[PDB]
Symmetry: C4
Subunit: 219 residues, 4 copies
């Protein structure tokens, strides 16, 4: 029966059937957004949902027999396992993000349709050549985050009061988002020289990011 | 009479006469902006306007005899047909965007003048090689837009209340426009962890956009 | 006497004596900023200023005998001429931008010193390759500025009330500066669909802008 | 005894030992952030801290016997000396930024670990090729900063009242941060034409900046 199901799983129809359900379940998840729709077809959709969830475990179960160890060494497959897994935790208990993290299954359209995998893989592949920079930056943030917490956190605890707060604020400055009228001009009403901390922070961080982009535009 | 008009239409004079009317109508539309001007010469320019609109239908009518089916397979010609057609719909009924959309005809200066045509075409040609990325993104947006509506839309309905609103807000975050003091700092007063939703969203979307720019700097 | 002065003019000393005066007049113009400094040594630097202004006209006169027609076909010389001409208009009458435009003579440090000229020339030379795009954009801005004035200027006359106002706001939207919470979210409280005007405007303008950068990265 | 210690210093175990203390001290400084941790184990931490500072001077002392002049001609060694030196100034007196600048020793992780050195070096090396542009820009900022101080500083002293203030505001405009609703629209309520100063400022500075990115993307 192995080759029987190995012929079911590997079949064009099987895959296209899965893809058909995803786009349907995707359409169905945008409708569960509407408080109106839920009042008229909420039941239609809750069951349709639980149904598709089974079909997917069945598939994932099947795909495993047909592949065994080869499966748990496939990025894309591991993904669909964990994603379907999330959607299996009963609609209750623990955290309610789990109910919300269900919509992660629509990323299966990326997993199950080639070309996406190409582009996603294309994208991801660039990351290894960025790890040296990403490490460098995280050290830098961490250092400045520590300096800021202890230079500005007493008077400005919303923004710099905690190591993590400072991390966040520094991120915002780095995205150059309201950094001046939002953060630094206020700071300077108390700490006139704060511009000496933030202009150098901005130059470095922006410089680094240009280099990183240029590097990607080489490799 | 065909070759007679085919020699009228294809003539340098004809083409240059059209270009002359556009820059004239374009000048005339900027003046229709002034409430002052309209109170003095509004009559002049309403008639001048209907005149140019006739001339353009005549031209578009002529151009169709001279080209027949070759014409309704020309992007640039199709454009002008539609753009002129909009300007034909009476100054009444339906909506008023149709009165306003009339100004789209000044895009004929792009259509009726090469180099422009070249440049526009140069640009557009870059699009097909982005469609794989654009699909990826629109999937990503759609996924997060749904998550956001159901995680933040109850307490923050102006921003995430509806799927469409989440889309808009997510767009704004993507343009990195007032994203922190504007959206996420507020969100965190109620949902401390919202940063776990928006920082990842920012990284991915910015990464992807950098890739897409680099892709265009290859092809 | 011609070659006598042609030998003074072309002397390394002469050109270096000029460069020496620029850096002094530049140093001296930053000090004129201080309300304090002016109360002490104001009279010192008003004369020192007028002194240098003479010297530069003497030079520019000298530079003209030595070069004649050749001089008025030199960008850098024409510049130097107009920038000194501005500085001769009597500290009085007309507009007082003329008093302020005097600080443009510090751009003579760009003229008088090579490498700067190289770099400036390097930059400027990239402009002609951009004029097709720049033309395209200005047409596009013009078209939308008109739609916006007539779509939003009645209710929102600060931002769209006038063609020029619309230009400015559109520019601001193009720099992506406070565009959502600043302009469009307001606009939508009255005109729900305004997003249909601004999201497309944003795509096109950012797309084009990316293209333009990449072109400057292949030429 | 020289070669004995030259064999100690150059030892793999030595270098790794140093790298070990940095990650330990770096972890330690993040905990010194916690007002909680300090009440608990503050004592534990200040001694462990002084200990490390001892160890590091010994190393730098040792490192010097083993390299003499060669050491004070090594960028990375100079850094480590100057960094440990900052951390040597007693926990008292003068400026308290000195207590804060201590955390700069975590940059020794860049210094003591290669690949980092590589990447930093990679980055830093791009700078020389940018000094013509950086010069061009600084002259530009200086010139406009002066015009702005004298054009707007009387009515707008927070933003333009002083040369340094103007420098700051101009930088903020250059980062395109809140530049319109934050600075120029205000400005225009009094000085209708201020758009004539800031749009050109914005064009030039953004133009130059794009060039500088491309220059890097070639060299
Ligand atoms: Mn902004």
């Amino acid at each position: 029966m192995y080759l029987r199901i190995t012929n079911i799983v590997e079949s064009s129809f099987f895959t296209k059937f899965i893809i058909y359900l995803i786009v349907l379940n995707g359409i169905t998840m945008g409708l569960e957004t509407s408080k109106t729709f839920m009042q008229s077809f909420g039941v239609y959709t809750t069951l349709f949902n639980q149904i598709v969830i089974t079909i997917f475990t069945i598939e994932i179960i099947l795909r495993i027999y047909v592949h065994r160890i080869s499966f748990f060494k496939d990025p894309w497959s591991l993904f669909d396992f964990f994603v379907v897994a999330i959607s299996l935790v009963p609609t209750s208990s623990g955290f309610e993000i789990l109910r919300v993290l269900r919509v992660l299954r629509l990323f299966r359209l990326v997993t199950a349709v080639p070309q996406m995998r190409k582009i996603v893989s294309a994208l991801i592949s660039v990351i290894p050549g960025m790890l040296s920079v990403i490490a460098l930056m995280t050290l830098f943030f961490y250092i400045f985050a520590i300096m800021a917490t202890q230079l500005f956190g007493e008077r400005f605890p919303e923004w710099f009061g905690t190591l993590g707060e400072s991390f966040y604020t520094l991120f915002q400055v780095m995205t150059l988002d309201d950094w001046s009228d939002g953060i630094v001009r206020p700071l300077m009403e108390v700490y006139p020289y704060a511009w000496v901390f933030f202009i150098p922070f901005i130059f470095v961080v922006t410089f680094v990011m240009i280099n990183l982009v240029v590097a990607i535009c080489v490799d």
